[PDB]
Amino acid sequence: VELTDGFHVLIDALKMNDIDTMYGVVGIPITNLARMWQDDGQRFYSFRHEQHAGYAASIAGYIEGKPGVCLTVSAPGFLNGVTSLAHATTNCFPMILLSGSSEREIVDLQQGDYEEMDQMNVARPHCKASFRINSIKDIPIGIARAVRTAVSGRPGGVYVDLPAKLFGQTISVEEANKLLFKPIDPAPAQIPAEDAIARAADLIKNAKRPVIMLGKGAAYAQCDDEIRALVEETGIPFLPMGMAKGLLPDNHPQSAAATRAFALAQCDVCVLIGARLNWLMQHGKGKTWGDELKKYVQIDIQANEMDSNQPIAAPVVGDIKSAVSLLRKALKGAPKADAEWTGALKAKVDGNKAKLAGKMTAETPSGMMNYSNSLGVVRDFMLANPDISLVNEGANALDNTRMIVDMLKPRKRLDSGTWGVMGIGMGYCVAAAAVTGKPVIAVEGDSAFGFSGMELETICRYNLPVTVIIMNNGGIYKGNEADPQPGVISCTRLTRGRYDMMMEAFGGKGYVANTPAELKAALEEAVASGKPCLINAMIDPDAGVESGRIKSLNVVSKV
Amino acid sequence: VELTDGFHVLIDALKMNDIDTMYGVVGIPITNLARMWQDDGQRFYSFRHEQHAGYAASIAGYIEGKPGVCLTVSAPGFLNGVTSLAHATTNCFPMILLSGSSEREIVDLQQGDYEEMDQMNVARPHCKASFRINSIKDIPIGIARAVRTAVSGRPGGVYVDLPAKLFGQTISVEEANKLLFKPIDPAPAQIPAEDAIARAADLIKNAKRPVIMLGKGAAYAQCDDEIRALVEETGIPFLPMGMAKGLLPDNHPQSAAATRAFALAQCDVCVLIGARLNWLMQHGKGKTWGDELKKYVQIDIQANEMDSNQPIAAPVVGDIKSAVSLLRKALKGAPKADAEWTGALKAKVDGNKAKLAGKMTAETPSGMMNYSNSLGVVRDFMLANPDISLVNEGANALDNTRMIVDMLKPRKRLDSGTWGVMGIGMGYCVAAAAVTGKPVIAVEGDSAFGFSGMELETICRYNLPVTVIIMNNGGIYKGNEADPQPGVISCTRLTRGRYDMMMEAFGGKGYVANTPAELKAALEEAVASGKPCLINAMIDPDAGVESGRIKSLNVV
Amino acid sequence: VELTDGFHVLIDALKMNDIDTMYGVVGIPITNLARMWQDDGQRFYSFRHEQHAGYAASIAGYIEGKPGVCLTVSAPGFLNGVTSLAHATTNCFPMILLSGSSEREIVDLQQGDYEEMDQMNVARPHCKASFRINSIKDIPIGIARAVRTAVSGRPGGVYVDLPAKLFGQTISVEEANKLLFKPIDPAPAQIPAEDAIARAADLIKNAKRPVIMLGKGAAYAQCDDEIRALVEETGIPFLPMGMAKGLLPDNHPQSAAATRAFALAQCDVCVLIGARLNWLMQHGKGKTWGDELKKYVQIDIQANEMDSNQPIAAPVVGDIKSAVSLLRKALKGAPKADAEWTGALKAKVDGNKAKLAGKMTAETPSGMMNYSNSLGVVRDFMLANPDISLVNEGANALDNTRMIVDMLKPRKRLDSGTWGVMGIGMGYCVAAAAVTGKPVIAVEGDSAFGFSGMELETICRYNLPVTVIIMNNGGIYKGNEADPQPGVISCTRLTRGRYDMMMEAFGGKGYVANTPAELKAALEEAVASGKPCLINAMIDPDAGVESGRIKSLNVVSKV
Ligand SMILES: CC(C)(COP(=O)(O)OP(=O)(O)OC[C@H]1O[C@@H](n2cnc3c(N)ncnc32)[C@H](O)[C@@H]1OP(=O)(O)O)[C@@H](O)C(=O)NCCC(=O)NCCSC=O
Ligand SMILES: CC(C)(COP(=O)(O)OP(=O)(O)OC[C@H]1O[C@@H](n2cnc3c(N)ncnc32)[C@H](O)[C@@H]1OP(=O)(O)O)[C@@H](O)C(=O)NCCC(=O)NCCSC=O
Ligand SMILES: CC(C)(COP(=O)(O)OP(=O)(O)OC[C@H]1O[C@@H](n2cnc3c(N)ncnc32)[C@H](O)[C@@H]1OP(=O)(O)O)[C@@H](O)C(=O)NCCC(=O)NCCSC=O
Ligand SMILES: Nc1ncnc2c1ncn2[C@@H]1O[C@H](COP(=O)(O)OP(=O)(O)O)[C@@H](O)[C@H]1O
Ligand SMILES: Nc1ncnc2c1ncn2[C@@H]1O[C@H](COP(=O)(O)OP(=O)(O)O)[C@@H](O)[C@H]1O
Ligand SMILES: Nc1ncnc2c1ncn2[C@@H]1O[C@H](COP(=O)(O)OP(=O)(O)O)[C@@H](O)[C@H]1O
Ligand SMILES: Cc1ncc(C[n+]2csc(CCOP(=O)(O)OP(=O)(O)O)c2C)c(N)n1
Ligand SMILES: Cc1ncc(C[n+]2csc(CCOP(=O)(O)OP(=O)(O)O)c2C)c(N)n1
Ligand SMILES: Cc1ncc(C[n+]2csc(CCOP(=O)(O)OP(=O)(O)O)c2C)c(N)n1
Ligand SMILES: [Mg+2]
Ligand SMILES: [Mg+2]
Ligand SMILES: [Mg+2]
Predict the structure, then answer these.
(1) Which residue, of B330, B347, B364, is where some domain finishes?
(2) H or E segment at A340?
(3) Is residue A371 located within the same domain as residue A388?
(4) B271, containing H or E segment
(5) What gap in Å lies between CA B49 and CA B44, rounded to an integer?
(6) Rounded CA separation C214/C231 (Å)
(7) What angle do CA C414, C420, C424 make, to 5 degrees?
C-alpha cells in the first residue's frame, strides 16, 4: 500500500486552494516544507525577518483577493510573523500565517521545550480565527477553514499552527486523494435587501451636496467599472482614501480630492463605500464634518460596522459589487448631482491644483530638494507609466506623496494603512513584484525605510524590478533638530547615509539624486533597467513638518 | 439648563432599541440602575444567582429574535453571568451581558480594588464582542453596537462593561436627545447569488434519497411558512434537531424523525438548514452516515461554517428566510421526492411509533414509573395543549422527552443545547414565561434540576404559570448504584427528595405523582391553575441507562 | 507484562501527593475517575453544581494548607468550577481544579466537538498556572507541578486539563512505579535578610502608637503561637481582619478590634502580617488612615505586593513563620508599647463593647428580631463552643456577625473574602465539615444563601453536622422596599420563605426561630444533634442598612 506524508498532503492541500507562492524564513521545524514546496515547482521567497515576509503575504492578499501565505518557525519566528497578521486583520487583508510549533506534551506542561509557546492561543487577538492541524487527515479541512475564514465576511488574517509531528505522519495515497478537496465558492456574494438600497437611493436623490468616499475595501472588491459607472451616472463628486487612489483615475473630472476639507465640511449626504469612519475620517465628527451629523449612506460587508462611530441613515450590508450593482439600477434615470455643488468643488479643485503646480516648479539648492519638486518628478513619471505599483510610507514622505503622486490605475498604491505602520516598505515591494510581474517604485521616508531596510538584499536576491526612493532628509520629520546637550545627538536624528552604497553591497544599482533633473533620469533609467535599484534622493533637512498632516494628534508639554 | 445622568441615558438608550426587560441580581454598583429601570415602568426579574438570570436572557433572545439583557455586578457577579453569555454564543442566541465594574485607576494597577477584574478582557472568549462604555456621550452608540453585534451575522453574546463612574456622569437633556438614536435595520437580510441557489437546486432535483435537516437556527429565523412550503413542495422527508421540533408539527406526515438512523445512513443528499454538522450530527461521518461522504446543501448566515467538518457540495450563504424563498422558486414545478424513498421511511416511522406506544401503554408499580409511561402523559397533554413552552434537561429525561413529547408549535421546546448544559431549567422557565405570557412545563432530570433549583423561589415570587416536573429517579442516570465502600454513598446517587415540599416552602403548589394517572391529574390541574407548581414524579431508580442516547461517548 | 492505566496512575499520583478527598460533579468523561477514586478507598463529595464543589476545594486548601481538589466535566462544568478557582486565586487559597476535556483535534479546528472549549487557555486569567497532561507518563510530574504551583510562593488556584484520551492510555506497572514520586518540600520556608528585619525592628522600637494588623494570610500560615508571642512580647495592640479573627482569641486584652477606626486613624506605625492594603483597608489612604502615610511594616511572601498601594517603609519578604520568628528575636528585651496608647485604646474597646452588650440585650416583637439580639445568641454559643467552624456571608448578616460573633480559635471563621462573594456558604460547610470532622454553623443572609442553597441536599446526603442559620429578613439589605409600580415587586425583595421546610424536604431538621430564646434552644439542639439542621431565624424586614458597612461604595442618582 503506497504512502504519502504530512509535508505533501499540506503541499497538495495548499495547491488545491490555488496557493502557488509562500513568503517566509526557514529553520526548525519547517525548512523541509519550504524545500519541498520548491521541489514540487512552487515559489518560496525567503526573507531576512519574518515580519517582512508577513507584510508581503498581507499585501498579496489585498492585491489578488486570495490569501497571502506566510511561513515561519516556532516561538520567536511565529511572533515576528504574528505582528504582520495583526496588521493584515486590522486592514482587512486576506492572509494565512502558517507556523511550525513544538511538542504538545512539553509545551502544555510548560517544561521548557525548544521555542516554547502556545502559538495558537497567542495569535488570537491578532486574527479572525486561530487553528491547529494536529492530524494528517484534517489538513484539507484545516486549509479550507483557513481560506474561507480569510476571504469570507470581512477578509483578514488566520493563524494555522503546524505541530512538528504533523509533517512525518503518514497516510495512504488513496486516503489522501479522497480527503483532498476544493472549497466551493469560498468568498460568496452577499446581496442586500431591496429596502436597504431604496433607503440609500432616496437619500442620494434628495441630496443637495452629495459626496462619495471610496476606501480600500472598495478597491479590494475589484469592481472598478461598476463603481466608476455609479459615480459617472450620478454625477456625484468623489474622494478616494489613500489606497483607493486609482480606483477611478485620480485625474477624473469628478474627483474632489484636491478640495477634501471643503467637500466633507459642507456635504449633506456622504456615501461610504468600503471605507470605515475610523480615525482617518475623524470618526464622522468635529470640524472636518462641519460640527454636524451628515446623512451617511454606507456600503459594507460587515453588518456591525454600521453605527460604530456615528448613526448611519442608510446602512447597506453586503459585498460592494452586489450592492453597487443594485444602487445603480435604483438610481438609473435620475437627475445628476446639483450643478452648483459640483461646480463649486470643481473651481476649488482647479485653484488648489494650480497652486501645487507652482510649488512643484520651484527651484532649490543641490542636495536640498523639497517634497514638492522632488515628488513632482514621481508624479510626472507615474502619469506616463501608470501600470506600476507605488509603495509608500513615512510622515512627510507619505502625506506629500498621496497628495502629489496621482494614480491612474487600481490596486497600485500600497501604503502604511489603518495603523500607519512604518515597516511595510520592502515586503510590499517583494510581494507586489511577485504577484504583478511588473515594476515597483517605493517612496520611502528614511526613518520609515529603516524598519524593513535589510530586505534590500532579498529584493536583489530575486532580481526584482523594484526601485526604492529614499526621501533622505536625515531624520524623523526633519533632520536638523539641535543637540539636547553638548555632543548628544537628538532622538529624531538619523545618519544622512549612503543608502545607494548599501544597495550596491548586495548587487543592486545605487543612485544619488541631488536635483529634480537628476532624480528624473535616475528613476527613468532604474525602472527601464528592470533590475533592483535604489535612488538616494537628497531632501532638505528643514523641508518637512512634525508628523506631516497629523501634527494635531501629537501630545506636547505646556508645563 | 436642565441635566440628566448616566443612569437615565442608559435606560433611554435601551428602550430605544426595544428592550423592556432585564434579568439579573442587584448590588454594588448597579442596584439603582435596576430600581430606576422599574420606576420608569420596565420589567426587572431578580434571580438567586446571575447564571440563571443569564440563561434566562439567552433563551429570551432565541424566542424573540432580539437580545436578552442580563444585568450583574462586578467580578464574582460578572463571572457567574459570563458563564451564561458563553453558552449563548455557542448556541447562537442574541444576548447582552451588562455588568457594573470598579475603578479603572485601581483595577489597571492591580492594587486590590473592590471586586477587581478586567471584566472586558475576561469576557472575550465567551462572546462576539466585549465593549466598555466609559463616557456618558457614548451610551447611545455603545448600545447600538451591542445590539447589532448580538443580532447580525451569526447571532450570539455581547459583553458591555459599565464602570461605576459611568452612572453619575451628567449631560444636558438637550445633548442627550441629540445623541439618542435608533439603529436602522440591525439584523439585515442577506441574500445568496442565483448560482449558489441553482447549484443547491440541481443537487436536490437529481437526488434519489434526499433529506432535510432542520436545526434551531431555522427555528430562530421565524420563517415557518417558507420552510414548511419548501418541505411540502419538494416532498422531501425532513428531520428536526432538538429545538427545531415544532417548526413543522412533529407529527407532520413527511417527518422521518422516528426513523432517524436509517434516514441519515441511507440518504444521498442532505439539506442542512440552520444546523451545524457538529457532534449532534456525528460530524457528518462514521456509522451514522453510512461511512460515506454525502452531498450536502447547507444554508447558513456564517460563511466560514461551510467545510468546517465535511466538504459542502452546495454552500448557500445568507439568512434562512431569503435563502429558502429563493430555493423554493428555483424548485417550483419540479417532481417530488422519489416515492419509494418517502414510502419506505413512512413505513419505518409507523412501525417504530407503534413500538413506542406499547412502552407508554405498559404498567409499572406505584412510585416506580419508567420514562415511557410517565412521559406518555406529557405527550398527550402537549398534543391537546401545544401553545405551551417545554423546558427539558437531564440525560434519560432529556433524550426520552425529545423522542416521546411531540411539539406541534415552533420555538416552544427549550433544552440543554449545543453544550449539553445542565443548569438552563429554571432560568428558561422564567424567561419563557415572561416573554410569551403563556404557560410553561419543565421536564427536569433530578440532577439536572439541582443546578438551577433554588430559582423555584424566583418562579414563585413572580407567580409565574410554570409547572416543573421532576423525573425523580434518585440520581445521575440511575438511582441505585451500589455503595463502593461500606456505608459510603456512590457519586451518582441523589437523595430521592420531596421537591414538592421545597416548592411549597416558597408559596408554590406541590404534587407527588406515583403513577401515570396521578401525574396526569396533577399536570392538568397545575397548568389550568396558572400558578407556580412542582410535580415530583417518582421514577424507577433502575429505569435509566448510562448517559442516555450518548452512552458511547463515555470513557470506561 | 502487567499494565496499569491513566485512571490509576492519576489516582496514585494524587495519593502520593497526600490528596485523599475530591469535591465534584460527575458526567462525561470523568465519571469513572470519580468511581475508581471511591473504589480505591478515597472520599468523593458529589455536589449539585460545580461552583460549590469548587468553593469547597478552595476553603479546604485554606484550612489545611494543601490544595483542595475539585473535579469537573468539560466546557459547561469546567466553566462553573473555574469561577471558583478564580476565587481561590484571588484569596490566596491552594486549589487544583481538574477537568476532563474533549478531543484535541476537533477542538483545535473548532469543528463543534462535545462540550468544546480550550479550557486550558480559558482558565489562564483565573489561576497561577494552567496545565494539561496529554500523556500517561507525565501524570506524576503534572500533579507535582500543580501541587507546587498551588502551595508555593503566594498560594493559589491551578488548572489541570485532563483530555478524555488520557484515561484509557496504558503503561507497564513497572514503568509507572518508577515515574511515580513525591515532591520534596513543596511549600518551602523563605527567610528574609537580617537588614529587612532590622528596618522593621527599628520602626517598631521608635513607634509612639503602633498597631499590628493580622490578615488571613497570617492565619493560613499556621504559626499561631509565634504570632501571639510577638503581640504579647511587644505589647502592641492588634486588629484582626475578617478571617484572622480567632488567630489570637478575639477577647485577647490587646485586641483593638472594637476601636478600629480610632486605632487606624491615629497610629504612627502599622505592622501588616499576611494582609494586603487592598479595598478592605481602603488602600492605606484617606480618612480611615487620618489622611496621612503611616510608616508601614509589611510581612508578605509575595515580593511585589510591596508598594502596591502606598510606600512601605519596612518591607519584609518571606513566609510569615520565618519572618515573625526573626522579628521576635530582633525585638526581644525591648520596652513594651506606649502605655498611654494601649490604655487609650483599651478604654475605647471597653466603652464600645458595653454599648454593644446593651443592644444584644434589647427586646423585639416575635418574628421581628434585629441583628444584635439574634446574633448575640450565636456570640454566646461560640464563646462556650469555640471548636466549631463559623461560615458567614451576606451584607448585614456578614458585617454584624464579624462584629458580634467572637472567635476564640483559628481558621474557624470562613467568610465572603477578598471579592465579597455571595455563594461560598454551602460549599464551605461541606468542606469544613469534611476536613475538620467537627461541627459547622453558618450565619447566612437570605439573599447570600440563595446562591448555593440547593446544596442543602448535599449536606443532608452526607449526613454532615452542619447548622444553617438563615437571617431571614425577606430581601437584599431589607425586605420592605415598596412596589415601584402597582402590583410590581421591588428588585431587592425575596420571598420570606420556609427554608426550614426546604431542609426537611431532603431529610434535614428544620426550625423556625421567632425570638432570641427560641434561636438559642434551636442552635444548642441542632449542634448537639450532630445532624444536618437549618434554623429559619425571623429578622425584622426593616432592621438592616443598605450594603451594611460598605454603603459608601454604592453609586446613587442625584439627577
Ligand atoms: C488622516 C487623513 C485621511 C486626513 O486627510 P488630510 O491629510 O486632511 O487630506 P489629504 O487627502 O491627505 O490631502 C491634504 C490636502 O491636500 C489637498 N490635495 C489633495 N490632492 C491634491 C492635489 N492633487 N492638488 C492640490 N491639493 C491636493 C487636499 O484637498 C487637502 O487639503 P484641504 O482640502 O485644504 O484639507 C490623512 O492625513 C491620512 O490619510 N493620513 C495618514 C497618516 C498616517 O498614516 N501616518 C503615518 C505616519 S504618523 C506620523 O506621525
Ligand atoms: C446526539 C443526538 C442528536 C443523536 O440523535 P439520536 O438520539 O440518535 O436520535 P433521536 O432523534 O433522539 O431519536 C432517538 C431514536 O428514537 C427514534 N424516535 C424519535 N422519535 C420517535 C418517535 N416519536 N417514536 C418512535 N421513535 C422515535 C429515532 O428514530 C431514533 O432511533 P434510530 O433511528 O434507530 O436511531 C441526540 O442524542 C441528542 O440530541 N443528544 C443531546 C444529548 C445531550 O446533550 N444530553 C445532555 C446529557 S449528557 C449525558 O451524559
Ligand atoms: C471593609 C471593612 C474591613 C471595613 O471595616 P469596618 O466595617 O469599618 O470595621 P469592622 O471591623 O467591620 O467593625 C465595624 C465597627 O464595629 C466595631 N467593633 C468591632 N468589634 C466590636 C466589638 N466586639 N464590640 C463593639 N464594637 C466592635 C469596630 O470598632 C467598628 O467601629 P469603628 O471603630 O467606629 O469604625 C469591613 O467593612 C469588611 O471587612 N467588609 C466586608 C464587606 C463585604 O465583603 N461585603 C460583601 C457584601 S457587599 C454589600 O453590598
Ligand atoms: N468585498 C467587500 N465588499 C464590501 N465591503 C468590504 C469588502 N471587502 C472589505 N470590505 C469592507 O471594507 C472596509 C475597508 O475599510 P478601511 O480599511 O477603513 O478603508 P480606508 O482605510 O480606505 O477608509 C471594511 O470595513 C471591510 O469590512
Ligand atoms: N437567521 C439565520 N439565517 C441563517 N443562519 C442562521 C440564522 N440564525 C442562526 N443561523 C445559523 O444556524 C446555525 C445553528 O446551528 P446549531 O446551533 O448547531 O443548531 P442545531 O443544534 O439545531 O443543529 C448556526 O450555524 C448559525 O450560524
Ligand atoms: N505562608 C505565608 N507567608 C507569608 N505570606 C503569606 C503566606 N500565605 C499567604 N501570604 C500572603 O498573605 C496575604 C493575604 O492577604 P489578604 O488576602 O488581603 O488578607 P486579608 O483580606 O485578611 O487582609 C497575601 O498577600 C499573600 O501573598
Ligand atoms: C512601527 C511604528 N513605529 C513608529 C511609528 C511612528 N512613526 C510615524 S512616522 C515615523 C517616521 C517618520 O519619519 P520618515 O519616515 O523619515 O518621514 P519624514 O517625515 O522624514 O519624511 C515614525 C517612527 C509608526 N507609525 N509605526
Ligand atoms: C454544568 C454541567 N455539569 C455536568 C454535566 C454532565 N451531566 C450530563 S447529564 C448529567 C445529569 C444526568 O442526570 P439527570 O438530570 O438526573 O437525568 P436522568 O438520566 O437521571 O434522567 C450531568 C451531571 C453537564 N452536562 N453540565
Ligand atoms: C456573586 C455576587 N453577586 C452579587 C453580589 C452583591 N451582593 C452583595 S450583598 C448581596 C446580598 C445581601 O443580602 P443578604 O445576603 O440577604 O444580607 P442582608 O443585608 O439582608 O442581611 C449581594 C447580592 C455579590 N457580592 N456577589
Ligand atoms: Mg525623514
Ligand atoms: Mg436522574
Ligand atoms: Mg437579607
Answers:
(1) B347
(2) helix A339-361
(3) yes
(4) strand B269-273
(5) 14
(6) 10
(7) 50
A183 & A203 share domain:
no
Q: How far is the CA of C520 from the centre of ligand 12 (A)?
A: 21
Q: Which helix (H) or strand (E) holds B175?
A: helix B173-179
Decide which of A167, A188, A209 is a domain's last residue.
A188
| Residue ranges near ligand 12 (ion) with Cβ within 5 Å | C 445-447, 473
Q: To 5 degrees, how large is the angle CA A150–CA A155–CA A159?
A: 35
- Whether residue B389 sits in one domain with residue B310: no
* Nearest atom, ligand 2, residue C28 CA: 50
Facing C105 at nearest CB: one of A120, A138, A161: A138
Taking the CA of residue B318 as reference, the ligand 5 atom at the shortest distance is: 4
Contact call for residues C93 and C61 (beta carbons, < 8 A)? yes
Q: Which domain holds residue B38?
A: 1-188
Residue A195: CATH number of its domain: 3.40.50.1220
DSSP-assigned letters across all residues of A400-441: HHHHHS---STT-EE-STTTT-TT-HHHHHHHHHHHH-S-EE
B453: contact with C, CB 8 A cutoff: yes
- Say whether residue B27 is in contact with chain C using an 8 A CB cutoff: yes
Which DSSP symbol is given to B99?
Answer: E
| C141 → closest Cβ in A109, A131, A132 | A109
Between C49, C279, C460, which is nearest B114 by CB?
Answer: C279
Reading the block at residue B516, the C-alpha cell is 401515570
Give the residue from C105, C109, C137, C165 with the most A CB atoms within 10 Å of its CB, the best one to mutate. C109
Same domain, residue pair B98 and B153: yes
Do residues A91 and A212 both lie within one domain?
A: no
- What's the CA gap between C109 and C96, in Å, rounded? 28
Q: Compute CA distances A255 → A207, B408, C227, whole Å.
A: 18, 60, 81
Phi and psi (nearest 5°) for A130? -125, 115
Residue B405 Cα to chain centre, angstroms:
17
Q: Quote the CA–CA distance of A355 and A404 in Å, as a whole number.
A: 12
Q: Which residues of B, range 114-173, sit inside 8 Å of A by Cβ?
A: 129, 141, 144-145, 148-149, 152-153
What CATH number should be reported for the domain holding residue B5? Answer: 3.40.50.970
Nearest chain C Cα distance for residue A121, angstroms = 7
Q: Specify whether C69 is located in the same domain as C171.
A: yes
The three-point CA angle C552-C553-C556 to 5° equals 85
Residue nearest to atom 1 of ligand 8 (CA): C77
**Does the annotation list C352 as a binding residue?**
yes
Q: Counting ligands in written order, which one lies closest to the CA of residue B383?
A: 2
- Name, in order, each residue with C-beta under 8 angstroms of A351's C-beta and a sequence gap of 6 or more: none
* Candidates B292, B306, B310, partner chain A, best to mutate (most A CBs within 10 A): B306
Contact C502 B498 (CB under 8 A): no
Residues A148 and A264 in one domain: no
Verify that B373 and B451 share a domain, yes or no.
Answer: yes
Pair A162, C132: CB distance under 8 Å: no
CB atoms within 10 A of CB A528: 12
Rounded to whole angstroms, the Cα distance separating C24 from C33 reads 11
Residue ranges with strand state E in C281-410: 295-300, 314-317, 389-393
Of A441, A497, A443, A500, give the one whose Cα is nearest residue A471.
A443
Q: How many angstroms separate the CA atoms of A82 and A123, rounded?
A: 7
Cross-chain Cβ contact C83/B83 below 8 Å: yes
Exposure string over A477-507, b if 16+ CB within 10 A, otherwise e = bbbebeeeeeeeeeeebbebeebbebbbeee
Q: How far apart are CA B159 and CA C482, in angstroms?
A: 31
Cα–Cα distance, A221 to B506 (Å, whole number): 62
Angle, alpha carbons B180-B44-B461 (nearest 5°) = 170
What separation in angstroms does the CA of B371 have from each of A414, B302, B386, B540, C252?
67, 38, 21, 9, 62
